[PDB]
Amino acid sequence: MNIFEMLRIDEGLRLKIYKDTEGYYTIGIGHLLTKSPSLNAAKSELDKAIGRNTNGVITKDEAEKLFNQDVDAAVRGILRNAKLKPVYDSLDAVRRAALINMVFQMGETGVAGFTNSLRLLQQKRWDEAAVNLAKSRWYNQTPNRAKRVITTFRTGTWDAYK
């Protein structure tokens, strides 16, 4: 297991524009196109991201290419963030994967707001961190996904994904 496989499991893979859990237009492997309600706005954002006139459909390769860019961007978002970087630096390989997952899902800013949970992870207080992370909209909206990430922080293993 690795970050790629992990997020592929959590986000699935769709070749046609779709609505995410929040109802926003997305494609591929969790690749958010726009928060705007217009399918045209989304189609426009899609052609610009792919570099071609897509008509709202892309290939597997193209999805994987957005995926790679998106993973990369998340890591880099983390390393640049004064609140995130230090937590990330303090964790083992597994748990880092879990941190990346949340950033990919909610953005650097969203994650950086879990101040209390962040501090708990930095202190290596796994069970406490897991309880705190659960008291959030995040967990109430996408509970199964949140549970898997949370167990990952709690155990330092990939069990939740096996």
Ligand SMILES: [Cl-]
């Ligand atoms: Cl892009």
Ligand SMILES: [Cl-]
């Ligand atoms: Cl879920």
